[PDB]
Design a protein around this ligand. Sequence first.
Ligand SMILES: C[C@H](c1cccc2ccccc12)N(C)Cc1c[nH]c2ccccc12
Ligand SMILES: [Cl-]
Ligand SMILES: [Zn+2]
Length: 314
Amino acid sequence: VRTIKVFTTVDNINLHTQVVDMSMTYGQQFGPTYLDGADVTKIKPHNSHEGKTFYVLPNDDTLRVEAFEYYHTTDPSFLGRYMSALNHTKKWKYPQVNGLTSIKWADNNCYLATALLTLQQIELKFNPPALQDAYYRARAGEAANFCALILAYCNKTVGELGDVRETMSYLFQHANLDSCKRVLNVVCKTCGQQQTTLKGVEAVMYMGTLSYEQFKKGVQIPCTCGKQATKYLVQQESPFVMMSAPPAQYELKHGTFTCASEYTGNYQCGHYKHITSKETLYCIDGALLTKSSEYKGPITDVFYKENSYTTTIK
Ligand SMILES: C[C@H](c1cccc2ccccc12)N(C)Cc1c[nH]c2ccccc12
Ligand SMILES: [Cl-]
Ligand SMILES: [Zn+2]
C-alpha cells in the first residue's frame, strides 16, 4: 500500500492532514473532492499531490462548524457550487482600470464586474470571513474567489445573465447594515400622512428613482386609495444609499454621486457598464476605459455617499 500526505479543508483556513491510499480515488476516501476548483472525486492520487490542499464536503460535525463559521450558510450544495464557479472564474482576467479591479468580458459577467467595481467604492463590511477574505484578494487584483462566492451566494451559475440590483440585495444580507436606518413620510391628499422606519438592507436600497436629491424633496407614488401621494426622506443613517429605477436616459453630474450602473438592452438581454466620479467621469466597460466631463445614458442604479441626513421639512 503506497500513500502520500495531503491536507483536506472546507475553508482553506483549517487544514486537516490525511494519509491517502494511492490505489483508491479521492472520492472513495473523502467523498466529493476538489483540487484548485477541479472535481477530482473520480481521480486517483498522483505523486505531485503530496502536500497539496484539497477541498471536501463537510461530512462530520467538525467540518460543518468550520464551513458554517467561514461561509455563514448550512446549504450543503454551497461548497460544490462555489468550486464549480471558481473552476471558471480562476480563468477570467481582472484588469486594473483607474486603480480599480474590473473583469474582462466573458460568460455574461458584465453584471458581476459592475457589482465588483461598486463594492470597491462604497463603505461596507462583509460578515462571513469567506467574503471578507475574498474581497481583500479582489482588491489585491485576484477577484476569482470573490466572483465565485458571489455566484454561489446568489445561486447563479457562470454564463447566466444577471441584475446588479438583485446581486447587491443578496450580498447586502451578508454585510453589517444592522444599524442602517431610514425614516420616510408619505403625504396623500385623501389618506393623510404616514411615517415609516426601515432598518437594514431596506434602509439603503430604493426602487423607482435614481435621484437622491429628488427622494429628499418628494417622489410621486401610487397610494392604496388610487391617487398619487408624495414620499420623501425624513432621516437617513447609513454609509451609502443605492437608488435604482428601470433603465431610462439620465444625466450624471461630476461630483454629485459615487458611481452608477449603465444598462443597455432589454429585460432579457443587455450589457452593463460602470460610471464612476473621480476628478472627471470614467466609464469602465470591463477592460475598456473612456472618460468625459459629461454623461447622458441609460442608468438603472446610482450609489451615493451618506453618513447622517435629517430633512429640514417640518
Ligand atoms: C437592469 C435590468 C432591468 C431592471 C429593472 C427593470 C427593467 C426594465 C426594463 C429593462 C431592464 C430592466 N435587469 C438586468 C433585468 C433583470 C432583472 N432580474 C434579472 C435576472 C436575470 C437576468 C436579468 C434580470
Ligand atoms: Cl469586508
Ligand atoms: Zn391615499
